[model samples]
Target chain A: GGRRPYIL
Target chain B: PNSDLDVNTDIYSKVLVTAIYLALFVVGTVGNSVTLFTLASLQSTVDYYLGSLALSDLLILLLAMPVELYNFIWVHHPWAFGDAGCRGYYFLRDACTYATALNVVSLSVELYLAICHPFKAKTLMSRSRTKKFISAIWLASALLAIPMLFTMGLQNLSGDGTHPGGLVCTPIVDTATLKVVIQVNTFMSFLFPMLVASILNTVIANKLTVMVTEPGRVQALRRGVLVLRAVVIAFVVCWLPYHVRRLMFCYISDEQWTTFLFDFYHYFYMLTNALVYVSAAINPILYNLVSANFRQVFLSTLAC
Candidate 1:
């Protein structure tokens, strides 16, 4: 999967 | 110009935040100093890496934390430290930040080697080699942080027609350049190291589980894994918010910068910035909790 923005 | 977008004006909350920073500074300074001294006395390969990590963390607490505290406490005042101080402060902060991450990655790799390939570890890991590796880690960190020397300085805020706005120690570069820099910085300093260390920790944990070992050796490895896991977890937890805030700066548009958003950003920025220092301050405690030897040495050193 491609890199997606995830919450810290 | 939206010169009226004033946020972070609460003196009481600022005072409370300053108190927390002061406490972290005191604890980090004393704890990292003790950890460095104890590790230096031990003089083992692993000790050298831990000692270097302690030194970098101490540098962050000692050199960078004061400036952060000063800036937050006196937000309206012009930067008193001048141009060189501005550059030097950010440069040292970034350098030490990178060095901490690098040292963690190095330590994980060394641990994996030592546990997963015992014979190779003996040949590859020695005190002299560890010293060289530590030196290289610091040097690379400094080099990586060199961009700050040019990009960071006293940037003057735009005031209304009458008086000049106060100067701030901030990035002097344009938004596009800053976006790129922040993205790269986040990836190199936080994302890459976090990914590497997490994978290595998992591999080491798995290896420790399956290996048939003598009681003494197994116990030692178990302790090592415990310490490494704690340190890595602490690093991730403390640094994640800081990096997330930085990434937000890159993606969020000006239209999204409402008053509430501005307040939210600054408030969380203060908290997350403090958390970064918390990471620095908490490592020695992590060592004490997970490594009995570190605990004994810390207590004895305090007694002496």
Candidate 2:
């Protein structure tokens, strides 16, 4: 999966 | 799937992080409110700056903590707050973050001027001027945070119906743009302020040790220096890891990072998130510990 890391 | 990179999916980590955030939210809300009220009653130029700082911390805690908790606790849940809510959250969070750093830097610079250049401080530092300075700090913070409105939104993680994830409030911009925004944010909110405060506090500490003054005034200055030093030290310790994490996220490609590194970074990310809120929560305690006057006022305010 090429999902971007969830960041704040 | 690199979905394993999402470290917040574990039950234990989720509960631990949620509990930490809830504790910080309560402590920071009450602590900063009391600090602001007490400082308002004190009515000194220094108190004004501290009050502004407390207000910003309070805002950061109240506005950001709950949402952050929701994000961590229900990582798969769709963001219900809408696109505007998403953008506004990032905007206000960044603004307050910037304001907190600016307030500390301004306070340290004011202290340096008061102690090392008293004659000039008389003209340059007054209650009215300090108020104006606080206004400018807020204005600059808001202006700088405007970019967040464009850079963040409700981003859908599930590209197709097959994926299980939901829409999450996260950065929607391109990597290059996000990198630029994060670098600027780190520099403005952490690096520059940290550098300036350290140098100014060091100079103020040096001056406090050498300068001749009345016994009472010298004691006051000494206490003030101690308080400022503690506050600056706390700020750096709490924020350094945060900025480091941001930088790591920006520059380190996923392919370049090993599984160990990813795990470490994820854990570090959780710790750093908590630490950021800890910084907001801890300043009032610092003031209470280092300044007898603040402690007394805080007690009386509580008693009332």
Candidate 3:
């Protein structure tokens, strides 16, 4: 749900 | 599909990473080059060809991947000075190199498994030319697999429109859902998959090696080879385990939580952990020399 849950 | 935003660098940490990366580049480059030279001197053999290709893959990482991170340190947390296309090309090639190295590990594992368990059958397929073909196939497959990175990655402007400037990062240009998928898929393909393959093959090779101790002169040499091979596999696993574990865990945790600072830790820890991967490449040449009398003789004679 978070915008950047998976940090690139 | 990697790189995190916002880092506050310290002199001690920077100096420490500088030492690690410097050692990695020097040792990895010299060691892999030596491995290639040593392997190329003799008539092509199955293991030699696989080892040579693996060395080449690692050599690329040492020469290309490690330097990028060190450069990132120089500019601090600023936007990618490399521009959009530079970002894309860098990630694409980096993914290609890393994937190729992982594939080489898997391929070498399978080759050892086949050779040890079914030598008679494997003998026909283990021709030097055939092995070279397989190496080429691995590079092609890895390159193809890495194509997704080019599209998924871009220079992400952290600021909304022109509201604020100087906050840009070259990272995967995807939403959270897609980012999760990308991270998971990358973890599986780049880390877990290869680790699984190598581990399984390691067990099979060890089992077969145990049973093949009937010969006199050859048994000793075989035992030494198996020992070194086990160490090499262990080196691969050890070097990769920490980073992959961190990556997988990061996917599950909230980056906004109080513990979110681990992301910063991940960013720092990665540089050190990655140095281990390059060291793994360098370890092979030293391993070969120590475990194989023949290789040592070649190295010594060459040195002389």
Candidate 4:
């Protein structure tokens, strides 16, 4: 949860 | 209240799910039923995944029907399930989610080998390791479910009887539980992203540096396409889910929920759903682009 992970 | 707000498509989003479930199922079954496994472990993962997809498809189809249609929405009290209709739906939903989680970890090992560390890939991404990894993944899925059972039976969300609500009970309850869950979600969402990003970037850069290999050049043409998709998909899918925690740091849940809360929830759910899409779509991408699909297809083909 450190940075946003990509979603599509 | 929410920043991941713009991309959330409540109706359009559901539409996309309908189109894809149909599209993916066709290929999934065709490929699944026709292919053979490269090894026993690969076989295990393929088998587990196919079953998992079947379950997922059923859930999505059910949820979509009610959410998308006005008549159903008006009448379906148990929008999430069947209260008078059946009893086991809640348990089923939990099982499916947990299984899906384990599957991701299982696949990561193979991915790590093939894409991240070729040295490891060369030494261990063979039949035995593949077999072991699949076994580990399934066993790992067991932890997801838990002991003694969640509710005495299935939980009734609203008024419907068959659908289940989100299982919030198993969510991090104490510091230790919170720590563990955070660690895991972080690893799965963040750690994997970093690892995969680095691995893919290195591969992309390494391939980019070769000025003379036409074959490798042709490969990057498509590699870039899949590569970009994977990276972007990860970014979008994880955006809100992780961002919520950070947002929480600055503001309490109430502050966010009271003002534009629906907007916030949508953003969170959307990012998560996108993550779900990314996971499934990647398999399809690999099936289309990588030799890996061949091994999976072969296994599905066998009455073996």
Candidate 5:
């Protein structure tokens, strides 16, 4: 829950 | 001031869902548009009539349904930024298109069955003008059936509902019992009952076509028709069955603590079946254009 998906 | 949006927005699911929908949207739009144009150039057989009607319904699903779903993936945690009218319009068009697609499939199945099983009668009964009337009736009936859904649904804030402590969602505004009845009736009318009828009709038509067609070209055409019928029926049932099952479970299961937790999590799974659902719409053009010789020629020539 620390960061968004790398794709975005 | 507001805190940053879910820093942990589920990007895996988002990418997966968004990619799938984007593909479906682009491919489905182009494919259905090409199919429509190709069918328009035909001599207007009953099969072409039904396929064109089905293609239009597929376009609606691709246009309205898939985009809303993609929007949901991006804004999973955000309140519906689209306002109340957008909420109303979305559900209305989505249900209308969905019901229209189901009805068109059923209508086409029954028409094909009649042509195979009772050719002489179908000749008189399924004339061009009559088929036009049937297509009109399907859309009119589907739109009418979806009106109740439009009135009963809207954007709802779930802050009071626990799961969405600070969330606004678009959904139905009805009591549990009424919602249950609605889901049950829609499950039967929209998918289950229609699919059951289509499956039976398609199976019979396939058998009859096997026994009836004698020439090589006619046999090949019949074989392709039977294959298309099988794919549509299988795709519909597989894609939609899980959704109805999930809906029924949610309706019957009482409001326990775990139920709340389960609901919160599965809110994601809600759009998962849509990939399968709209896949049918996207795949139909491929099946008809690639597998059927006449359809391929017409589609290629129309595009050229």
Candidate 6:
């Protein structure tokens, strides 16, 4: 959650 | 709903992709093609981003046509004739990821120009430099996607975003040969974007002082104004895609029916719509921003 995880 | 266009008939959004369909066209550019490229949408609008190559669209739409072929990878969920997509989707997973390498470089040079040189706005902002940047974006974006063009398991897809195919249907990234594909995707999609966010925000601060301030050493507020607009709009349009893209990850392996999944899917729909809006506004910004449109007209006059 700390990181802006790749989502798309 | 049948799987849809990535980016469409274009890369990346609209309510139509989840189910097979059409009819969401026209936006942006005011460009040779009037189709919509709006709402500040699609974090992966790399084709549009690395679009300087097709700027010659005035002379040839071939490059422009080819620009989004990477996303059309799944068009009709079919690939063939040994075309990379046909060959790789069945053979190697990383190869599929590598397909987008060249156009994804927006993260790199945008950084060099924006980050590596924050204070010197005009240093590399010249017409020639812009041309070079255009080249860099196109080249770098192409350079990164693997398509199994690599050697080992070194390559990994940029990972799923709000737009990747879901069905777990066996992947092959477990093998080798497309190291660049996997790694570059992560680099281009995630790392580069992070860099862009940082530099863009920094440049925003700088532009605020330069042109926005009014009292300048022969400064033209418009240039700073346009850059700021690019920064704000790009970040604003792209930021959500990343978040939504992450949310999109959930859809990769689960049923798309649960309340949480339903919410996520709904979020994607909402974001995609907004992306279109921003894209259309992007073109409008040229006219509304005052400087961009005038410069465009002046450039056109030179051609005539």
lDDT of 3 by residue, B1-304 (tens): 1233445456677677667666666666655565656555112344454464455446455545554555355443344444553445445444543544454554455455544655554445446565666567556645644544543443444454332233444444434544554564456445665666566566656665675545254444454445446545554554465555445544544555343454455464556455544544555454554556546754674574
lDDT of 1 by residue, B159-225 (tens): 5433344555667787788788887778899889989999999999998787854436667678778
Looking at candidate 1, what is the lDDT of residue B156? 56
Candidate 2 local accuracy as lDDT? 0.78
Better of 2 and 3 by TM-score: 2
Pick by lDDT: 2 or 4, better one: 2
DockQ of each: 0.03, 0.34, 0.17, 0.04, 0.04, 0.07
Q: Clashing pairs in model 5?
A: none
Residue-level lDDT tens digits of model 4 in B124-192: 555555556656654554554342132222233322423343211222133344344445444654455
TM-score of each model, in listed order: 0.90, 0.89, 0.68, 0.46, 0.69, 0.45
Q: Write the per-residue lDDT of candidate 6 for residues B1-304, one digit (tens) a residue.
A: 3232122223344324422212112223333333123211111222244343123222112221122222232332222122443333322322211222222234334433443354664343555555565566444434443343432211122234233332222224432323334444556544555556556556645654663333432233334335444644563454446434533543344333344553444446445534533432343344335554345653454354
Docking class of 6: incorrect
For each candidate, the alpha-carbon lDDT, in order, equals 0.76, 0.78, 0.50, 0.40, 0.50, 0.36
lDDT of 3 at B152: 41
Ranking by lDDT: 2, 1, 3, 5, 4, 6
lDDT of 1 at B194: 82
Candidate 5: Cα lDDT at B155: 35
Per-residue lDDT for B141 in model 6? Answer: 38
Candidate 6 is scored at a TM of 0.45
Residue B118 lDDT in model 1?
81
What is candidate 5's lDDT per residue for B1-304, written digit by digit as tens?
1232232335676677667666766666666566655555112454554464456456455555554564445554445444453455444444544544554465455545444655553455445665666566556645545544443343333334444423434344444644654564456445665566566666666666575634364544454456556545654554465455446444543444253444443443546455444654554454564455656665676568
Top candidate (lDDT): 2
User: Per-residue lDDT tens digits of candidate 2, residues B1-304?
Assistant: 3253254456788778888888988888888887777865112888788888888888778877777677544453466677887899889978988898888788787777777787786666556777898899999999999999999987667545245456667788878998999999988888888899899888887877787534476667777788778888888998888888877876777567666665566677779989989989998888788777779889899777
TM-score on B-chain, cand. 5: 0.70
Scanning candidate 3 chain B in windows of ten residues, the lowest lDDT window is B41-50
